[PDB]
Structures are given as C-alpha cells and as structure tokens.
Amino acid sequence: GGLTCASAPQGTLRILEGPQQSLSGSPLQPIPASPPPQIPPGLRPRFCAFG
Amino acid sequence: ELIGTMEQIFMNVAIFEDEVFAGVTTHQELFPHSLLSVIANFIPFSDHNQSPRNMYQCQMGKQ
C-alpha cells in the first residue's frame, strides 16, 4: 500500500512564454544628423569706410 | 534606451546618421558630442585644436 518507483519518464517538456520580433525600421532620430550652421539671408555689410 | 558600461560592449552604436546600417547599428547616440564632458562642451571648436590643448582648456577654465 506504499508508494513505489514507476517507469522512467520517456520525455521532458519545458514551457516558457515568449513574444516575437517586429520589422526593422531603425528610426534613428526625431530631427536627425548634425544639422549644419548656415548663412542668414542677405545679411548686408554693417560697416563702411571713411570718405 | 539607457545602456550601461558592460552592456555597451556587445552592441553597435552609430554616432551620425548615414552611419546607421541594416544589420549593424543596433542603437544610435543622442547627440554627436555626447562623448564630451560638461566643461569640454564649453570649449569652442575643440575638433580643430590638438588634444593636449583641449585637455589643458578644461584645467584652465577652472582657475
């Protein structure tokens, strides 16, 4: 009436919960790159010679 | 994302765009001058001076 060893298991199942990968879009930056410093339009000379 | 000192050795981090690739370039840096300190970001045009100088600028701006 006691507990005895039974037949060895024939296989093992290991369960884990996993989600999946999306598409590669690689959206690097809101406003991207190093935007260049640049000329103010027209500007004009702010200096003249004497005479 | 936020990455750490040991987690940064196993990942590619472009600096400028057009340096980002498809398989490579897992991440990208926020600004190109992210590498420099707060004081080293106060030196003007540090890119065109030799390095022993820019390092000198950091010790002279504190005196």
Swiss-Prot record, chain A:
| Residues bearing PTM Phosphoserine | S26, S34
Indicate the transmembrane segments per the record.
none
Lineage top rank: taxon: Eukaryota
Identify the stretch(es) annotated as Disordered. 18-41
Query: Which residues lie in Pro residues bias regions?
Result: 29-41
The extra comment attached to this record reads: It is in an antisense orientation to and overlaps the gene of the DNA repair enzyme ERCC1. This gene overlap is conserved in mouse, suggesting an important biological function.
Description of how the protein assembles with itself and partners: Component of the RNA polymerase I (Pol I) complex consisting of 13 subunits: a ten-subunit catalytic core composed of POLR1A/RPA1, POLR1B/RPA2, POLR1C/RPAC1, POLR1D/RPAC2, POLR1H/RPA12, POLR2E/RPABC1, POLR2F/RPABC2, POLR2H/RPABC3, POLR2K/RPABC4 and POLR2L/RPABC5; a mobile stalk subunit POLR1F/RPA43 protruding from the core and additional subunits homologous to general transcription factors POLR1E/RPA49 and POLR1G/RPA34. Forms a heterodimer with POLR1E/RPA49. Part of Pol I pre-initiation complex (PIC), in which Pol I core assembles with RRN3 and promoter-bound UTBF and SL1/TIF-IB complex.
Which family does the entry's similarity section mention?
Answer: Belongs to the eukaryotic RPA34 RNA polymerase subunit family.
Q: What does this protein do?
A: Component of RNA polymerase I (Pol I), a DNA-dependent RNA polymerase which synthesizes ribosomal RNA precursors using the four ribonucleoside triphosphates as substrates. Involved in UBTF-activated transcription, presumably at a step following PIC formation.
Official protein name in the record: DNA-directed RNA polymerase I subunit RPA34
Q: Which gene encodes it?
A: POLR1G
Span covered, complete protein: 103 to 153 of 510
UniProtKB/Swiss-Prot annotation, chain B:
State how changing S51R affects the protein, per the record. In TCS4; uncertain significance
User: Where is the site labelled Active site gating?
Assistant: Y56
Where does the protein end up? Nucleus, Nucleolus; Chromosome
Role according to the record: Catalytic core component of RNA polymerase I (Pol I), a DNA-dependent RNA polymerase which synthesizes ribosomal RNA precursors using the four ribonucleoside triphosphates as substrates. Transcribes 47S pre-rRNAs from multicopy rRNA gene clusters, giving rise to 5.8S, 18S and 28S ribosomal RNAs. Pol I-mediated transcription cycle proceeds through transcription initiation, transcription elongation and transcription termination stages.
Q: Which protein family is it in?
A: Belongs to the RNA polymerase beta chain family.
Q: Which residues of the full protein are shown?
A: 632 to 694 of 1135
Q: How does it assemble?
A: Component of the RNA polymerase I (Pol I) complex consisting of 13 subunits: a ten-subunit catalytic core composed of POLR1A/RPA1, POLR1B/RPA2, POLR1C/RPAC1, POLR1D/RPAC2, POLR1H/RPA12, POLR2E/RPABC1, POLR2F/RPABC2, POLR2H/RPABC3, POLR2K/RPABC4 and POLR2L/RPABC5; a mobile stalk subunit POLR1F/RPA43 protruding from the core and additional subunits homologous to general transcription factors POLR1E/RPA49 and POLR1G/RPA34. Part of Pol I pre-initiation complex (PIC), in which Pol I core assembles with RRN3 and promoter-bound UTBF and SL1/TIF-IB complex.
Highest rank taxon of the organism: Eukaryota
Tell me the protein's name.
DNA-directed RNA polymerase I subunit RPA2
Q: What is known of its domains?
A: The active site comprises the fork loops, the loops and the rudder that stabilize the transcription bubble and assist polymerase translocation.
Record disease entry: Treacher Collins syndrome 4: A form of Treacher Collins syndrome, a disorder of craniofacial development. Treacher Collins syndrome is characterized by a combination of bilateral downward slanting of the palpebral fissures, colobomas of the lower eyelids with a paucity of eyelashes medial to the defect, hypoplasia of the facial bones, cleft palate, malformation of the external ears, atresia of the external auditory canals, and bilateral conductive hearing loss. TCS4 inheritance pattern is autosomal dominant.
